Design a protein around this nucleic acid. Structure first.
Ligand SMILES: [Mg+2]
Lengths: 53, 327
DNA sequence: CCTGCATCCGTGAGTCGAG
DNA sequence: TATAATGGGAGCTGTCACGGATGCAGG
């Protein structure tokens, strides 16, 4: 997306998106939990082991 | 050791933003506010309430305090009630909660990132009656105002828009707090204008101007009397501890008498006055006594009236010794 | 580690008068 | 309320002698 509508990138047809040339790489020590539908916690919440994400 | 050096150290801990990061943070903030408006449209709560709950959750458990704007007391109990009413919303609605959260986080990061600008702006305002750190703090308030009011759409670098608010707040502070006797900001503007004008006139005249010349360069409505009164109101008080002499010996306040408390001779003046008035009232008949003392208020503190008046005129011309009390 | 000596920091440094 | 601006600045220098605490090298 972008400021002006004519600067936006819209997909022509079906395809897969790859990300190249990042401005920087951020290494964070964290555990990544992928989900599917709905997340029960929000950003900033604090979680002990065993809490449902 | 040195507070300023410590603040400058704590400021050098946060690295400066790259343009992409600036834009990103600003965007997250704006979209966060929009998301808060959205959640207000959904839940039906106060936008301020929701905002302060989101902020409460972002900052931490350390900071929860009653806000003067809110209609309710904000305790962690209530922030948990509201948080539970926000989390229980449908998914597509629950999205805006996350948006708002990351919005607040982005706001914190954005304010913390630009803090050096406030220093570099406030360093020009030194010696105007406010301390360096105070100027820095008010400038910080300006910076926060800037963050909340900033629009990244205009493609202007944040420093541009922020600088204006920083100068605004710093100047507001200098105008507000720098005088022991508080003078309203517009009147301060008037005074400063008068001073600059006088400096100009004296610069061109090779001497200090009179009140009339200042009145001339001031324009319409301005005369000598107004200039004099304005300079009179611009006078700052002097300290009682102002040192008198070369040594540490005495203070300027030791030479000032107390004009309030009656000296023993004044209490004795009231005493002797009430006494002499009581004793020379022997003329009084009882009715005229109570009524004329009610006339002059000698009882509760607040035709026969005329006869008592006349009798008092009679006894005034008598002893001729009460003149002393009359100054 | 417990004792002893070197070092730093804070605290004092006459009275009254006159300015 | 909008070009962009992103870590301060002065310093006060020729006393003297003490108690108490604090710290470091040495037995
Ligand atoms: Mg005039």
């Amino acid at each position: 997306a972008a400021i002006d509508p004519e600067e936006e990138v819209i997909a022509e047809a079906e395809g897969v998106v790859h990300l190249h040339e990042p401005a920087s790489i951020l290494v964070v020590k964290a555990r990544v939990y992928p989900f599917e539908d709905d997340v029960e916690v929000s950003t900033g919440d604090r979680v002990a082991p065993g809490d449902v994400l | 050791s040195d507070p300023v050096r410590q603040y400058l150290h704590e400021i050098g801990q946060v690295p400066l933003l790259t343009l992409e990061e600036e834009v990103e943070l600003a965007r997250k903030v704006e979209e966060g506010m929009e998301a808060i408006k959205k959640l207000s449209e959904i839940t039906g709560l106060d936008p301020d309430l929701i905002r302060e709950v989101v902020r409460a959750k972002i900052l931490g458990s350390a900071r929860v305090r009653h806000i003067p704007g809110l209609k309710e007391t904000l305790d962690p109990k209530t922030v948990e009630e509201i948080d539970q009413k926000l989390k229980s919303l449908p998914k597509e609605h629950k999205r805006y909660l996350h948006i708002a959260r990351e919005g607040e986080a982005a706001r914190q990061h954005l304010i913390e990132a630009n803090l050096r600008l406030v220093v570099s702006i406030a360093k020009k305002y030194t010696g105007r009656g406010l301390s360096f750190l105070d100027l820095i703090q008010e400038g910080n308030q300006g910076l926060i105002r800037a963050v909340e009011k900033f629009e990244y759409k205009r493609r202007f670098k944040f420093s541009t828009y922020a600088t204006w608010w920083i100068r605004q707040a710093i100047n507001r502070a200098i105008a507000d707090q720098a005088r022991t006797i508080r003078i309203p900001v517009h009147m301060v503007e008037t005074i400063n204008k008068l001073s600059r004008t006088a400096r100009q006139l004296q610069q061109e005249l090779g001497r200090e101007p009179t009140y009339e010349e200042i009145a001339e360069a001031m324009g319409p409505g301005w005369d000598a009397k107004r200039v004099e009164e304005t300079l009179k109101i611009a006078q700052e008080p002097v300290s009682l501890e102002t040192p008198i002499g070369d040594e540490k010996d005495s203070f300027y306040g030791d030479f000032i008498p107390d004009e309030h408390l009656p000296s023993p001779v004044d209490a004795a003046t009231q005493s002797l006055l009430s006494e002499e008035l009581e004793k020379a009232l022997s003329k009084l008949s009882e009715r005229e006594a109570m009524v004329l003392k009610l006339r002059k208020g000698l009882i509760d503190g607040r035709q026969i009236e005329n006869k008592a008046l006349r009798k008092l005129k009679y006894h005034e011309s008598r002893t001729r010794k009460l003149r002393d009390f009359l100054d």
